[PDB]
Amino acid sequence: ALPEKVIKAYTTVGSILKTWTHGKLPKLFKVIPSLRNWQDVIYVTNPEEWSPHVVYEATKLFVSNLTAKESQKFINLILLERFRDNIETSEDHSLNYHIYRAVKKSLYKPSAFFKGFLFPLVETGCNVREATIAGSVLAKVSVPALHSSAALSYLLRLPFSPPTTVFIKILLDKKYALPYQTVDDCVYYFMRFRILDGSNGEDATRVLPVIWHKAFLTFAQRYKNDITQDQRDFLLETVRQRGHKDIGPEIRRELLAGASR
Template sequence: MGKATATSSKKKAQHSPLYRDITEDGGRLRENPRASKKSKSLKGEKDEEYIDAATSRKILQLAKVQQEELEEEENMLNKDSNITSKYRFQVPEDSEEEEDSDEADAEEFETLGEYDDADEEIEEHISEEDAKLFEQYLNSQKTFDGSQSYNLADKIMAEIENKKSQLQRTEEGEEEERGEGVMLPPKVIAAYTQIGEVLSTWTHGKLPKLFKIIPTLNNWEDVLYVTNTPSWSPHAVYEATRLFVSNLGAKEAEKFIYMVLLERFRNDIADDENHKLNYHLYRALKKALYKPSAFFKGFLFPLVETGCTSHEAKIAASILSKISIPVLHSSVALSHLLTLEYHPAIIIFICTLIEKKYALPYQTVDDLVFYFMKFRRAANANGDMMDVEDDVVRREQKLTVGWYKAFLAFAQRYKNDITDDQRDFLLETIRQRFHNGFGPEIRRELLAGKPRMSEGIKETEPEMMDIF
């Protein structure tokens, strides 16, 4: 093997230049060197000093064209002036006496009396309509007093007051026109009248879609009135109760219960031979109780306050006993019933709510104690016994069995929630209003009780709120 020469080793050690590697990888190199700042400045000065022949030729041509256009416009103006000069008003020779100096003009403007005749001639040519418009404009620039200018804020306030007065007039007119009728379009009245006819015989299936959208309407009461609710079938009443009670708020559901269920409840019991309530209406009342405040204010309280029979009270009380009601709603309803005059129907509802065995607040417990204490007698100055509540006891000389049942249920459930003084008053009441069947049992329950720990509110007791 021969030795490698020095030249061959030098050739192997050489490599390709850097610019080739850069260009092969997609890069770019500046081929021309950058111009220095001095060369740029010199070039700019040269450009500013010299203009080539082509550009100077174009500039001269444009200047020539513009000059020709200006000359044409001047010629046109001269022609127009010659034409108008033929028809120009010729001044008579007498007018030469008038001078056009500034002094003469000043003297003319100083004498205002000279223009009176001209003003009168102008007024003759003004029409009556233009004069009225001018007066309105002048009046709009004055206030109601006629002293100062009428600003924008006063105008806006005046327009607002006018709008309010117009709205009040329209509302009053609509109320007068409405009266006791229903203001609905004729097509709506016709459609919902047909739906009412369908609901009068409806027993099963799907309700009409037009009927399902009634709870979403703002004037749902008027639309419901058109359907003739007293003619609905009991099945339709149940489905309608489910629909309205679930989709309406408490206050709106109260209106529906009062409008539909209360009258149907009374009429169905009165019309039935056995004085029983239809099963579907009974279910409808149970559904209505899922909004307790609406049920109490829309059904129970009006039923009691307008006169309720014991038979109706028993049917309605059976619904209360079967449905779970929140304690606060029950306690407020119980307190309201205790404020009403004594009636056997009211006693049935009071006994039903007591037998539900709620953990009533002390406020409601005290109301129950005072209610039973009303029926005790006290001695007068002569030692004779007299009624504490004469107007109550004289109406019912003999207390009903329901009253003693309610008293016994209260003694059994709340004997540990009363104070010693309240216990003594209740024992005195049962001694005076003794009953052979209930008296001994009530006495035994009251004596077996323990006084409540404090006069305040229970630690675990919720606050009494105005939930209605």
Template sequence: MGKITVSETKGKQRHNPLLKDISSISGDLKTTSKSKKSKKVEKEEPDFLDAKTSRKILQLAKEQQGEIEEEEGIVEESRPSFLESFKNVESEEEDEDEDDEQYSDFEEEEELFEEEIEVNEQDAEMFEKYFASSNNDGFGGSINLADKIMAKIQEKEIMKQQPERQVEGVRLPPKVIAAYEKIGQILASYRHGKLPKLFKVLPSLKNWEDVLYVTNPEKWTPHAVYEATKLFVSNLQANDAQRFIENVLLERFRACIEDTEDHSVNYHIYRALKKSLYKPGAFFKGFLFPLVDSHCSVREATIAASVLTKVSIPALHSSAALAQLAERDFNPATTVFIRVLIEKKYALPYQTLDALVFYFMRFRKAGGEHQESMMEQDDDEEINKSLPPLPVVWHKAFLAFAQRYKNDITDDQRDFLLETVRQRFHHSIGPEIRRELLAGTPRIQSEPVKDAVMINAF
């Protein structure tokens, strides 16, 4: 038997579909869909019951309820009516309100009880610090002015209660002293590199002198002295820089010369002196004048004066310093500084020039005694022997003044200076001073003083 191909079966069907066969036979089966049938049923059902059927349902329910009550032995008269049940509900609500009021009263009593509790001071401080930090977090908190004042008072009381450490008259918190003692140990072995940040902050502190004393500047290395001088002189005002130069730099300068065998100064200390001239007024008041007033040796004066020769100084500062030095008592160290400042060849005001003229005139014999002696004896050597000799430094300073300012003195001043040369004659320097004074053209004595610069004393 051969196989049926697809082409043969395509054209004709083997049998009728089942739906057609069922519909051709008479029966109860309908061809409508279930959804349509359900819709029709829903439409046929009424939305509500009529009064008759509802009365029957209620009657049946009542009879069933009565039978149940008879079985359980419940008397119908003992059951509360609807009004009574409503009243009971209201009474229950009133009881609940009374309970709420009692609970609220209990809360109030509890709050009063909490207010009367004594809180520990430490716990209260912790509580206040916590809420103060939470207010400052930026979440809408605000601080009252009274709270700030009370907080400041509490901080002061706490600082008073904390034990402060005292180091030879310096009263600072113990943490500050411990930190800067370590800084002092670092500076005691410092050679190169950056300074500690805690040390760089010192010029900005109000009590920087007390904190600086803790670091023990006497044990600093010369390298640290140089770096500290740069830091303090550049960042402090002139008055504060003067105190640093006098208390630190001057002491280290003198100690360095005394401790060395050849009485020389360390290279870094010498560089620190140069840096201190960044503020000339602080240098003169904090280093030069205290050095001169404290029995300065010629060696110290020579080393310090060499710094002045290598650094440029404003003319007004140098003229004021000359005027101050000329008013001091005679000292070879003072004369060294006068000579160095004169040799800088600044245009000095007449006020300073007059002070220098009176300084050199101070060393001659004044009055009639000198005139009588001049009439009796004409030998300058005998006059010179009657007066105590002066060091060569003084004669060199006199010569430098005559060479530079011979045209800025009056005729009277030149005559007095020539007389001083005659009395304080030096065999090699005296003739040069006399020649310079005679070669000059003196200024007119009646010249207006308005060109002179009035210098205030330091």
């Protein structure tokens, strides 16, 4: 049950946004952020069929004027699906420049995009190319210390996965702050990756990848002093038992150059 004028205006605005490439956005679209039924207006206007530049502009306007929860809901329900569709059905699995700009804006304002997409991408099972693109975008435009630590703790407390491990590798390349709790979470992730000689799950016997090995090497190069004597010994034991053949030297060098906090 929607008004006929409302439906006509929404369809006309969606068509104008889909066909628009340059110029100014409509005042209807500018006052949509200052309205209530924004999700319904966007669904009627079909933002999936609209322009990526117009979508990036709408996301920036919502991040600059609207509220964080409405911004997170809109960002999830539009951008996550659109980015997944673009990555799956791109001509060469290539991300759009305007979509990347919108994602960079959403990362600059990370109070919404994390709970909107970062847990949602891992839950929806982003592919290897999608995980690599997400890690590259995060390394290009990271976030504040609190948001980075929350994202890292969420990724470590999440189960072992290729996309989660790639996200952990990109976060370790960014080299954010790891407190005692974050270092404990990293050590728990390493112990879960290592085998247990009574009850064991799947990661005890599951093989580890080169991305996970590089993530462990970067974590050892960054947070060597954030691990205590027992934590450094546990990291060295993990890097010996289930570590790589060629990363073992740098791993042991970092685990021996690390100091107890």
